[PDB]
Curated annotation (Swiss-Prot), chain B:
Cofactor(s) in the UniProt record: Mn(2+); Mg(2+)
Tissues expressing this chain: Expressed in liver, kidney, pancreas, pituitary, small intestine, spleen, heart and placenta. Weakly expressed in brain.
Cellular localization per UniProt: Peroxisome
Gene name, Swiss-Prot/TrEMBL: NUDT7
Function: Fatty acyl-coenzyme A (CoA) diphosphatase that hydrolyzes fatty acyl-CoA to yield acyl-4'-phosphopantetheine and adenosine 3',5'-bisphosphate. Cleaves CoA, CoA esters and oxidized CoA with similar efficiencies. Preferentially hydrolyzes medium-chain acyl-CoAs and bile acid-CoAs. Has no activity toward NDP-sugars, CDP-alcohols, (deoxy)nucleoside 5'-triphosphates, nucleoside 5'-di or monophosphates, diadenosine polyphosphates, NAD, NADH, NADP, NADPH or thymidine-5'-monophospho-p-nitrophenyl ester.
Positions bearing the site annotation: Important for coenzyme A binding: R54
Gene3D superfamilies for the chain: Nucleoside Triphosphate Pyrophosphohydrolase
A biological process term (GO) from this entry: butyryl-CoA catabolic process
Protein name (record): Peroxisomal coenzyme A diphosphatase NUDT7
Length: 219, 220, 221
């Protein structure tokens, strides 16, 4: 079995399908894209352009607002990823839908995890993406540069991470934070099963149940 | 080349905008694209995405915010046109930089007029453009659906046009208004020289000087 | 981004931009494309097609003749780079216009330095480019295969370099010479500041002044 075949195996146990579809919120989807490169797994990220209303300049996963013409939440993740980085449908296999996050009182973000084909080459769309980059999956469990702080908001205490990663190939440094960082850490732990060198939001011995309770406590 | 050659010739007299390229406003460029179809000139328009901060959903010319890495205002026009509708540098000849427009006290739009090659085919970028369409140039001097209102922006009374155009190919109707509509009427008159069926902001017998004087007035 | 930003800072001082852009020569622009790979800076080169009138088969930077429809010299450099290797405007930041070069008494080349995005992938246009390749920037100051000779041209004594570089990945070997080699050495010195293992046309302790003085000598004569 390949690196991505092993990931699919661990991710399947956490797929909750459509359990949290049809909820009365404004809907956004994101796609977490897993890439095998040089003998290990990485996650692909985007940097949003300045001209966007929502979250300009921020580091995020590919994705966006659910359009009235999209058939469902998964279709949104796939279309937005094609528009932002050139990913075609045959180049990604969606293997997991995760418990969603509420960024607002009104806004629900639904996350999908996708296995990315090895012959895919990113093509950033400069209309809405300033940059596209990779980070090794293991970095989110054993980082060289990382800080974190509690923020009760609201109520219940969440954890704000800030990861800093420098790509040795081209010398550019990126910061990954907020909901994007929470998701990277969760999926990294699911796939690699190593305890992080820091405290996390969820229960390491009870990942799925604690994840749902967390959402319900804000829903 | 005739049909575009004539337009270049008439536009030449009005090319003076570079003269204002160094005023420290928040700067944007637009490109007015002239296209030949069925023997006559048309203007090309875009419909902006809802995603965007500025003017989501509205009809406008291709263009955008001048980037710090752009070399000058015309480079902004060209790059944005490529990003929005797929127009490449060899497919357009820029032949005029017009007197700019203040959209508020801190923001300035520099307009460029470009002649478009007959083998160009639009490819709307769905990240920032919902639709792309053509309107005959003569329609802005002799429209079948048009209205006007007086609005007082930045200190003195301006005319706000509202045009409506239905494409007979598919039955889709578009609305063109505000600055976009002002610039379309001006360029149509410069090229076609037919007195419109309605009142306009500039002096029909003194187009260049009238236009400049208006700009200089609101700048002070 | 460290590597590209440090290059930008050093190139700043040499951006004698615009000054010579109005001299009525037959005008060409070139773009010097700086690329980060494997931790270090590289220069991107093209090999021109045979069917071209000017300099068929030769190794050079992307670029070409100023068209009557180009707005200015920078615009020429950007358009030609897109036509030749597929480089789009958002994938390059132009950070320097250098002192120009006369290749004859009637023809003037204006060089621009550009920082290239890491997601750019070259797409050679076979109508005018036979090949596209990289050379590490440090190679032009510390080469392993290199020779040079004085050449007296347009009134004064230039240096003609011949660099030879073999790409370990594919085993292809390239020769870089003439004006292209002079520009590569200068930009490498500006950015890395290592004194070369050979003689150069400019003053190592007075780069900007010696450069600008040389052009004015040839232009006057």
């Amino acid at each position: 079995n390949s690196l991505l075949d092993d990931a699919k195996a661990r991710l399947r146990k956490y797929d909750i399908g459509g359990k949290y579809s049809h909820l009365p919120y404004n809907k956004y989807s994101v796609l977490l894209p897993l890439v095998a490169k040089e003998g290990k797994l990485h996650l692909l990220f985007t940097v949003r352009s300045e001209k966007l209303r929502r979250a300009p300049g921020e580091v995020c996963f590919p994705g966006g607002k659910r359009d009235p013409t999209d058939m469902d939440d998964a279709a949104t993740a796939l279309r937005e990823a094609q528009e932002e980085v050139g990913l075609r449908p045959h180049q990604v296999e969606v293997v997991c839908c995760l418990v969603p996050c509420l960024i607002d009182t009104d806004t629900l973000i639904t996350p999908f995890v996708g296995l990315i084909d090895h012959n895919f080459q990113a093509q950033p769309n400069p209309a809405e993406v300033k940059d596209v980059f990779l980070v090794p999956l293991a970095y989110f469990l054993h980082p060289q540069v990382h800080d974190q702080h509690y923020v009760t908001r609201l109520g219940h205490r969440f954890i704000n991470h800030i990861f800093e990663y420098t790509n040795p190939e081209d010398g550019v440094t990126y910061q990954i934070k907020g909901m994007t960082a929470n998701l990277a850490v969760l999926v990294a732990f699911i796939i690699l099963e190593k305890k992080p060198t820091f405290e996390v939001q969820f229960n390491l011995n009870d990942v799925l149940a604690s994840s749902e309770e967390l959402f319900l406590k804000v829903h």
